Ligand binder design. Structure first.
Ligand SMILES: O=C1O[C@H]([C@H](O)CO)C(O)=C1O
Ligand SMILES: O=C1O[C@H]([C@H](O)CO)C(O)=C1O
Lengths: 331, 331
């Protein structure tokens, strides 16, 4: 089986570990977990049936049993954890956004590349059957020549502690806009924008509150998005061309419905687990299965979120938040 | 009754005349119609039961029986028709967009102002019960402090002859974006934007094809919109604040449903006429009734679309299409 080590024990790691533990046991095994102290780790390992527990990430890196490491840490803690794993020769699936700015990304990608090791950013949305069907509709030319993409993701997350935390690199862009940028990049072939324009405001805790972005893409098509940590939005994403519109319905960041020219299609989630910390958390299986296929084919990166695109998405996000003045220590 | 003269006999005038002829006869009477030749006018007057017919607009202006003139002409023909009516002392309800650029608007408004005569731009959307309810929700502070507005309107109109005509000032902005700009202006108190950013492409017939616009509004709120004459869009409009979202569902330019924080409300159209040339064409009654109330109170303009706002909407639209290079003779 693909032998997984789980790095950090917070909410996202529960979901992921839970999902992995529903997969065929000859395909995936969770063999270790690491926390910043032994008790947090041992408690996690009992709760989730993981044979080995560690009180540092460095120990999980060095475990010769682990083949791939899932980096579930908070935003500013990804880079050092990813770097430890790559140095020790582990493949890495790293939670989103991979790093807090472009240089963190470039640095992870250069390490992976130079060690000949697999690295992927866990933009789980891309592997949903509804997103795959959207790509197919684009490939088939069903919407005609493209014209415009649109995506939005906002909620009041002001009582979600880490979502509005300057020290944890929270804010609309890094929690929610990442989904918008990836959607728009996906529909326009992962191409680099020709021009970006941004408006938004800050939130009184030191992060961005609501931000809208206009991206000029090549070939005379553009997209825009709005994200927010205070204002509910429609949370859908569409792309349109001369023959019609395709739209991922709410929740667009883990979508189960695609409407293409009025025609609805539903793509049911796996039945298990229920009671995930995050809405639709069972859809994490799609990316876990994806990591195994890439590794089985000997790929050092995913064709669906290639590292050069992770770098561009990070360029875009950082340019966006710089245009409205929002900075972190790491810059 | 309020005695109406109808200027021009095309599709929009049928709808409007049809609507006026469903209203209480002690409240509204259609007493004349004018076309660019007598036969077009006489045929219209038989079809619609209008006692007097004219083969020029100048003759309808000078008719002492007409109190208010409805200017239903194509975009570039509004200004001269409005000016004739004002000179002859008629109140005027002028179809949208009032003029093709800001100067045409300024010039109509200055004439009306100086003659002490009522002028209103027929932005019919504003008088729909669903839009009025949206204003009330804004006034009541139901959504919390505002953050962002969004609106979109596109369809493939490339086989609608006048919609894509350079000579008739067609294009996405002047046919469809006008609805977006007015929606966004409405939700932000008719205030003048601090900054605008535009991306879009042209259409091979000489007009704009698809255009997205970002508008920075005061008090740290912004809106954006996308309009198109080739690409179907979701055709909804929303505004959101710290406590939730309000949204006018498709068709947003003549809306009958309002969703406010998940709660749906429907506002049925008048039962008559059916078979309007344009979708939901019966909602034109709301503005006809509005014109009569203003005139009855002796108003020289509408408090709901004040002329100073018509001027700003025209400033905005012209700035938008100049940013992407689209020009008409009149500029
Ligand atoms: O629990 C949820 O997951 C999302 C996260 O914010 C995105 O990972 C959200 O807002 C939920 O309902
Ligand atoms: O007939 C219609 O009215 C609209 C117009 O384009 C707007 O007045 C539209 O696209 C229809 O369905």
């Amino acid at each position: 089986a693909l032998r997984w080590g789980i790095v950090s024990v917070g909410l996202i790691s529960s979901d992921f570990t839970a999902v992995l533990q529903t997969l065929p046991r000859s395909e995936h095994q969770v063999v270790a977990v690491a926390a910043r102290d032994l008790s947090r780790a041992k408690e996690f390992a009992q709760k989730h049936d993981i044979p080995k527990a560690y009180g540092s990430y460095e120990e999980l890196a060095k475990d010769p049993n682990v083949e791939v490491a899932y980096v579930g840490t908070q935003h500013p803690q990804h880079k050092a954890a990813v770097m430890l794993c790559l140095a020790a020769g582990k493949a890495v699936l790293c939670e989103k956004p991979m790093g807090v700015n472009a240089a963190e990304v470039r640095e992870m990608v250069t390490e992976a590349r130079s060690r000949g090791l697999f690295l992927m950013e866990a933009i789980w949305t891309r592997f949903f059957p509804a997103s795959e069907a959207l790509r197919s509709v684009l490939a088939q030319g069903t919407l005609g020549d493209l014209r415009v993409a649109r995506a939005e993701f906002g909620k009041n997350l002001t009582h979600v502690p880490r979502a509005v935390d300057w020290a944890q690199a929270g804010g609309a862009l890094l929690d929610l806009g990442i989904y918008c940028v990836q959607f728009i990049s996906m529909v326009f072939g992962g191409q680099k924008p020709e021009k970006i324009s941004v408006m938004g405001r800050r939130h009184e805790t030191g992060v961005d509150d609501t931000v809208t972005v206009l991206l000029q893409y090549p070939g005379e098509v553009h997209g825009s998005f709005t994200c927010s940590i205070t204002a509910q939005l429609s949370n859908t994403a569409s792309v349109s061309g001369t023959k019609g519109m395709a739209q991922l319905l709410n929740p667009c960041w883990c979508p189960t419905e695609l409407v293409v020219k009025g025609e609805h299609k539903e793509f049911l989630l796996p039945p298990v687990p229920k009671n995930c910390n995050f809405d639709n958390g069972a859809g994490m299986s799609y990316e876990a299965k994806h990591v195994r296929e890439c590794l089985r084919k000997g790929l050092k990166e995913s064709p669906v979120i290639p590292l050069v695109e992770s770098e561009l998405l990070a360029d875009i996000l950082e340019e966006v938040r710089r245009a409205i003045g929002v900075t972190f220590p790491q810059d």
